[PDB]
Amino acid sequence: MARRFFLRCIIWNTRDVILDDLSLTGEKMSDIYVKGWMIGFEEHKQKTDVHYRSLGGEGNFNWRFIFPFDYLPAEQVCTIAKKDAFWRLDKTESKIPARVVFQIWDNDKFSFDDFLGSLQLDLNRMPKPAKTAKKCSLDQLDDAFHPEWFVSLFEQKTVKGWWPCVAEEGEKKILAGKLEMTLEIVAESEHEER
Ligand SMILES: [Ca+2]
Ligand SMILES: [Ca+2]
Ligand SMILES: [Ca+2]
Ligand SMILES: [Cl-]
């Protein structure tokens, strides 16, 4: 059966975010905000408020996202279709991995917002978070050589800490920002804590 879950995301802060603009005084800065959504549920995407005029790449948000999604425990696969009748968005089935996306953006008033970097996470196999922003690095993404550093959120239920965001210089990967988050998968009915 398809079971209804909820991904609860708190965006606490960002650090080291790329600075995309020049100030009227001529100082590098970004008007930072964070976009999030689950793949296959692009209709429910959400964003934080904007941390205006970040001069050192830091932003403060303390923002809560809730992402509802359907899940097949036995298949460990997302059903991009919501629930019940065809009236639901994404019709029926389509089985894909459960993944959430976080994107860091610079808000502009007099042009379009500019993409700064993103992080895409597999809820079944995701990199462990760094305790501090200092220990946050692209090494966290090393699924090839340190597979023990990937884990499953469904098993752990909750993870907190820092993850890196990435921008592609063509094939090359560059640290575009660091994201401090709490991630928790929540059931419709279960014990408050285990
Ligand atoms: Ca800009
Ligand atoms: Ca801007
Ligand atoms: Ca722009
Ligand atoms: Cl602007």
From Swiss-Prot:
Ca(2+) 4 binds at residues 108, 111, 114. Signal peptide: none annotated. Expressed in skeletal muscle, myoblast, myotube and in the syncytiotrophoblast (STB) of the placenta (at protein level). Ubiquitous. Highly expressed in skeletal muscle. Also found in heart, brain, spleen, intestine, placenta and at lower levels in liver, lung, kidney and pancreas. Residues 2-137 form the C2 domain. It is found in: Cell membrane, Sarcolemma; Cytoplasmic vesicle membrane; Cell membrane. It is linked to Muscular dystrophy, limb-girdle, autosomal recessive 2: An autosomal recessive degenerative myopathy characterized by weakness and atrophy starting in the proximal pelvifemoral muscles, with onset in the late teens or later, massive elevation of serum creatine kinase levels and slow progression. Scapular muscle involvement is minor and not present at onset. Upper limb girdle involvement follows some years after the onset in lower limbs. Belongs to the ferlin family. All seven C2 domains associate with lipid membranes in a calcium-dependent manner. Domains C2 1 and 3 have the highest affinity for calcium, the C2 domain 1 seems to be largely unstructured in the absence of bound ligands. The C2 domain 1 from isoform 14 does not bind calcium in the absence of bound phospholipid. Interacts with CACNA1S. Interacts with ANXA1; the interaction is Ca(2+)- and injury state-dependent. Interacts with ANXA2; the interaction is Ca(2+)- and injury state-dependent. Interacts with CACNA1S and PARVB. Interacts with TRIM72/MG53; interaction is required for transport to sites of cell injury during repair patch formation. Interacts with RIPOR2; this interaction occurs during early myogenic differentiation. Interacts with CAV3 and PARVB. Interacts with AHNAK; the interaction is direct and Ca(2+)-independent. Interacts with AHNAK2; the interaction is direct and Ca(2+)-independent. Key calcium ion sensor involved in the Ca(2+)-triggered synaptic vesicle-plasma membrane fusion. Plays a role in the sarcolemma repair mechanism of both skeletal muscle and cardiomyocytes that permits rapid resealing of membranes disrupted by mechanical stress. This is Dysferlin. It comes from Homo sapiens (Human). The chain holds residues 1808 to 2000 of 2080 of the full protein.
